[PDB]
Nucleic acid binder design. Sequence first.
RNA 1: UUGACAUUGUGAAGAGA
RNA 2: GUUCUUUGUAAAGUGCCUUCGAAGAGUCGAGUUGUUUGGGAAUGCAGCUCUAAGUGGGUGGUAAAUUCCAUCUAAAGCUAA
RNA 3: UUGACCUCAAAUCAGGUAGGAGUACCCGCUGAACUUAAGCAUAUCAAUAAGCGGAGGAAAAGAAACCAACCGGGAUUGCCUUAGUAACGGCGAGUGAAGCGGCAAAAGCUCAAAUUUGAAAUCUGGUACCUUCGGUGCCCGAGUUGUAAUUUGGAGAGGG
Lengths: 194, 99, 58, 203, 148
Amino acid sequence: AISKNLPILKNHFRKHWQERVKVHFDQAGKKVSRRNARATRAAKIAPRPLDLLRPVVRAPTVKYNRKVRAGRGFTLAEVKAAGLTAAYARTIGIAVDHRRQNRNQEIFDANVQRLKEYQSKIIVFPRNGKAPEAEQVLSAAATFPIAQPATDVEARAVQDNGESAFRTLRLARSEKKFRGIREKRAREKAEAEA
Amino acid sequence: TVKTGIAIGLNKGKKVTSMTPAPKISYKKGAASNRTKFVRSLVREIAGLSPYERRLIDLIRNSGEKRARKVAKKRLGSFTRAKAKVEEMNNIIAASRRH
Amino acid sequence: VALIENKKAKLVLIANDVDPIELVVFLPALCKKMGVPYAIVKGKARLGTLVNQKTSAV
Amino acid sequence: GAYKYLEELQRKKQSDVLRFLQRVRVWEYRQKNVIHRAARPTRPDKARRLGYKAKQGFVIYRVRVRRGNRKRPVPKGATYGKPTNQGVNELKYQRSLRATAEERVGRRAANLRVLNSYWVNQDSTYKYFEVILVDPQHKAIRRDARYNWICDPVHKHREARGLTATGKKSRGINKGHKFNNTKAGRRKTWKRQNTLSLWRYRK
Amino acid sequence: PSRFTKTRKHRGHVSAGKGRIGKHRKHPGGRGMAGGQHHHRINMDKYHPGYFGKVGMRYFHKQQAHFWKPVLNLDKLWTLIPEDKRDQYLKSASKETAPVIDTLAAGYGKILGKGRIPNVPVIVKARFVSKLAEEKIRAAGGVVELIA
RNA sequence: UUGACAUUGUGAAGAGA
RNA sequence: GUUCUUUGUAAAGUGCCUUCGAAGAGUCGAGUUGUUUGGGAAUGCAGCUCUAAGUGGGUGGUAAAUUCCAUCUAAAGCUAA
RNA sequence: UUGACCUCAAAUCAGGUAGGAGUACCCGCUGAACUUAAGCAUAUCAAUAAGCGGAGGAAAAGAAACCAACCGGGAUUGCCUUAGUAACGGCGAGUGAAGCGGCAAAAGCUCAAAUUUGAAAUCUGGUACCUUCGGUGCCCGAGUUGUAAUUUGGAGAGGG
Ligand SMILES: NC[C@@H]1O[C@H](O[C@H]2[C@@H](O)[C@H](O[C@@H]3[C@@H](O)[C@H](N)C[C@H](N)[C@H]3O[C@H]3O[C@H](CO)[C@@H](O)[C@H](O)[C@H]3N)O[C@@H]2CO)[C@H](N)[C@@H](O)[C@@H]1O
Ligand SMILES: NC[C@@H]1O[C@H](O[C@H]2[C@@H](O)[C@H](O[C@@H]3[C@@H](O)[C@H](N)C[C@H](N)[C@H]3O[C@H]3O[C@H](CO)[C@@H](O)[C@H](O)[C@H]3N)O[C@@H]2CO)[C@H](N)[C@@H](O)[C@@H]1O
Ligand SMILES: NC[C@@H]1O[C@H](O[C@H]2[C@@H](O)[C@H](O[C@@H]3[C@@H](O)[C@H](N)C[C@H](N)[C@H]3O[C@H]3O[C@H](CO)[C@@H](O)[C@H](O)[C@H]3N)O[C@@H]2CO)[C@H](N)[C@@H](O)[C@@H]1O
Ligand SMILES: [Mg+2]
Ligand SMILES: [Mg+2]
Ligand SMILES: [Mg+2]
Ligand SMILES: [Mg+2]
Ligand SMILES: [Mg+2]
Ligand SMILES: [Mg+2]
Ligand SMILES: [Mg+2]
Ligand SMILES: [Mg+2]
Ligand SMILES: [Mg+2]
Ligand SMILES: [Mg+2]
Ligand SMILES: [Mg+2]
Ligand SMILES: [Mg+2]
Ligand SMILES: [Mg+2]
Ligand SMILES: [Mg+2]
Ligand SMILES: [Mg+2]
Ligand SMILES: [Mg+2]
Ligand SMILES: [Mg+2]
Ligand SMILES: [Mg+2]
Ligand SMILES: [Mg+2]
Ligand SMILES: [Mg+2]
Ligand SMILES: [Mg+2]
Ligand SMILES: [Mg+2]
Ligand SMILES: [Mg+2]
Ligand SMILES: [Mg+2]
Ligand SMILES: [Mg+2]
Ligand SMILES: [Mg+2]
Ligand SMILES: [Mg+2]
Ligand SMILES: [Mg+2]
Ligand SMILES: [Mg+2]
Ligand SMILES: [Mg+2]
Ligand SMILES: [Mg+2]
Ligand SMILES: [Mg+2]
Ligand SMILES: [Mg+2]
Ligand SMILES: [Mg+2]
Ligand SMILES: [Mg+2]
Ligand SMILES: [Mg+2]
Ligand SMILES: [Mg+2]
Ligand SMILES: [Mg+2]
Ligand SMILES: [Mg+2]
Ligand SMILES: [Mg+2]
Ligand SMILES: [Mg+2]
Ligand SMILES: [Mg+2]
Ligand SMILES: [Mg+2]
Ligand SMILES: [Mg+2]
Ligand SMILES: [Mg+2]
């Protein structure tokens, strides 16, 4: 029923919930076995570093657009700009993403840079089995980390051009609101042509 | 389009050096396509008009055109997908009188 | 067909018996517009023995 | 290439021509069995489009289905329950006749594998369908590498499990915001969000 | 734990702590929030006023982060400058080399007007600042730069 | 049970505001 | 890690000019009915009825007309963790 | 008179395949009421139990007719969080997901529509012969109502 002064809760347990219930007792063994599953991959995979090179990508919306993120793959422009074909760029381990075109240069620069700079630190074995003994690096992404583009500097001079930064946003938004109202009163002003 | 670099406003956004990607083949799925444009136009008159297409044009060259857009919207089941059939009839109407 | 589209043939033989009939009927309207003279003939299987097979159609 | 003509031809069905072909064949279908063998596709272009090829080991079967609402097989009309489940008459199957067809013919040939199916004809009583079966035992299909995935026991009776073109349709498998319920698989995705997840160190 | 629990205290007394007259039954009053409009009316008004009915306007497919504006005040500000440098920048008080504080990259993106700041100048890199905030930054001889 | 729509094709007269 | 064969009177990669670029229908879509969904002038599913287009089409979570913009390419298919 | 063709039959024809069991998990269909609402019909129980069809070692989902509206992101699955939120709801009892972000694992792809047309280049079987998960030669069959190569939208083809 309903008594005393307590927040109203909502507990969705009318449904036979005791049927579908997952404890994780295996969190230990699902890690110990999640490790051994990776450990022997890199064994079987030999000097190769377990993962593809992954690009630098901006990340979306108004919230996370500030930071930068590892994308899916390098797209097309950057792959030829790195001097190689798609079909080969997957053979040297690299992430190729055929969607995600390039609308931004500062990223496109840094990404192609990230490719050649990758092509540098690698060594790509030949057809034969005669190769320089190959000490294996397991990481790739942490061997080629992703910094945060630095933007501004540490200190500058005060440039006060006499604008109210607040009053901007007022007038910037007031502009957005009345566009369709001011296009229509010009639309009715062009009908002053008699 | 051109980003004002301001927190909010009409065109508001962030200023980044403005690239532009090479268009995708996918983006044109309309595909004028010589073979199609000719093969359909051939077929178009082999099978002739269809019972609704027929009485659709009877409507146009009789009372009303807006009248014929009523039945067009009803029969095909959309407004802007009607006119494409309606205007198409005005093309087929030129198979007769003005050659 | 590809020939008749590209005007590379002269005499066409289209057999009367084809199910489906849609495999053909467009040609007599197509062979006229492409100016290739055509002949509706007997023997879908008769045109075939000409070509080594059991049946032919065109 | 003659195919695109038939493909655009058939796309005008109420044409003065095809109504004749429709009427003529639809009668010929009725006189025959509900489920019977067709020695070659009525549509060579459509079967083509879906992966039918003319090589040995491909088969085409044709079938009738009974067209329209499913009646509660409830004895007197008696529901025995709350008024919301009272309904008998206006009630719709959650699958399509096309899927009903695939299943019934997939049963008749128990040795083949259903690949796909297409509509041919319909009257008030029947919709008519031709179904593409692929012989998994036949060497031509086994050694053909673009097909022999169908010899994998994974794909046994893919029509019953809704793994065909129609199945995933009715099963609702699509990306996007409209397919949230049953995209990852319905019951799978229900049971998922209905699970209580308790860790060792509780959160 | 159990040995601490009062139901061990009650072993030996009839009826646990539940009473002889009223006992402890299954569901007197009804399960859950039942009867909030009727026999629980007095408890829904008084401790949950406004609980019943509708108010205002709906929003379809509403996604937060269209709204994301973590709020920061001149009350703090200078925290965004690491501790040691904060000293010498306060000592500087320069319009020539003056510290740059990027609020959006600092986890923020609306700057408010609460509380006093030094006369030491600041370059405020932000989006969405309040009217009184800015004017108080002008008292320190500093500016705001709108970004995104 | 009644109406509609669809199964639904081919023709002829003589009538309705 | 062995030594063969010679696959190559085959196959693949890459540059540049100009032209061309076929892409799935009783389907998509719609009406209505039922059901289902958090999906609300309708989330999916199916019945009957209507039934598209090719600078077209779908989506853009308030129905409609109009004007644009953004983003993908249905109605055929295979795949490890 | 004789020879093919289409369609359709038969055989204890030559070679095969389906059934049934299992059912913890898996893909679907079908489908409740007890119950909660302090009554009860919508609603809740529950898109559950029971009933039915089909699998595997995982199944399924998947290289977007996606998400977003950003400086954009980029197959799918799962964890963490979104979130008991948006929304649904005799707006009552109740119900209730998604986009982002962190992590686990990461893998991409092929057909159909194109004339080989200076050459069906494709393929099943039978057969001897061997080096037998098959290899060659020969032969009947399939197939032009389209078997091969080539191309799959990220393209790509013809020419130069
Ligand atoms: N939101 C995510 C979830 O948060 C849960 O955690 C919730 C609770 O643990 C925590 O509640 C605490 C409570 O533990 C503690 N003993 C008393 C404290 N007043 C409560 O906090 C509560 O009141 C405070 C102040 O009014 C507010 O922040 C808020 O209303 C609420 N969290 O508030 C959290 C709000 O979510 C769990 N960690 C987990 O299920 C999951 O992370
Ligand atoms: N609110 C959601 C979460 O609830 C949690 O709740 C924890 C405690 O509040 C809760 O304590 C309950 C208490 O609420 C209740 N009124 C009495 C009960 N004896 C306690 O239970 C405790 O004692 C029993 C007996 O040995 C143990 O078996 C149990 O594990 C222990 N938690 O045990 C919970 C952990 O199992 C936490 N407050 C916090 O993580 C968060 O708020
Ligand atoms: N259109 C001009 C260019 O044509 C090019 O055409 C491609 C092919 O047509 C071209 O021909 C290749 C040739 O490079 C290579 N060295 C020899 C190879 N046999 C050819 O291959 C090609 O030609 C044969 C016929 O010979 C055809 O079966 C088929 O078109 C293709 N396999 O090689 C190109 C490899 O991309 C590309 N589409 C592209 O660079 C560009 O469009
Ligand atoms: Mg990894
Ligand atoms: Mg009979
Ligand atoms: Mg055969
Ligand atoms: Mg029942
Ligand atoms: Mg019942
Ligand atoms: Mg789909
Ligand atoms: Mg004690
Ligand atoms: Mg005691
Ligand atoms: Mg005692
Ligand atoms: Mg007592
Ligand atoms: Mg006693
Ligand atoms: Mg007590
Ligand atoms: Mg007692
Ligand atoms: Mg009591
Ligand atoms: Mg309420
Ligand atoms: Mg009746
Ligand atoms: Mg009547
Ligand atoms: Mg009638
Ligand atoms: Mg398509
Ligand atoms: Mg149902
Ligand atoms: Mg509905
Ligand atoms: Mg569009
Ligand atoms: Mg697909
Ligand atoms: Mg699949
Ligand atoms: Mg797989
Ligand atoms: Mg035998
Ligand atoms: Mg069985
Ligand atoms: Mg079963
Ligand atoms: Mg009750
Ligand atoms: Mg009661
Ligand atoms: Mg009662
Ligand atoms: Mg329900
Ligand atoms: Mg069950
Ligand atoms: Mg098994
Ligand atoms: Mg596994
Ligand atoms: Mg699978
Ligand atoms: Mg694709
Ligand atoms: Mg994803
Ligand atoms: Mg509702
Ligand atoms: Mg009420
Ligand atoms: Mg409530
Ligand atoms: Mg529910
Ligand atoms: Mg849901
Ligand atoms: Mg052979
Ligand atoms: Mg052989």
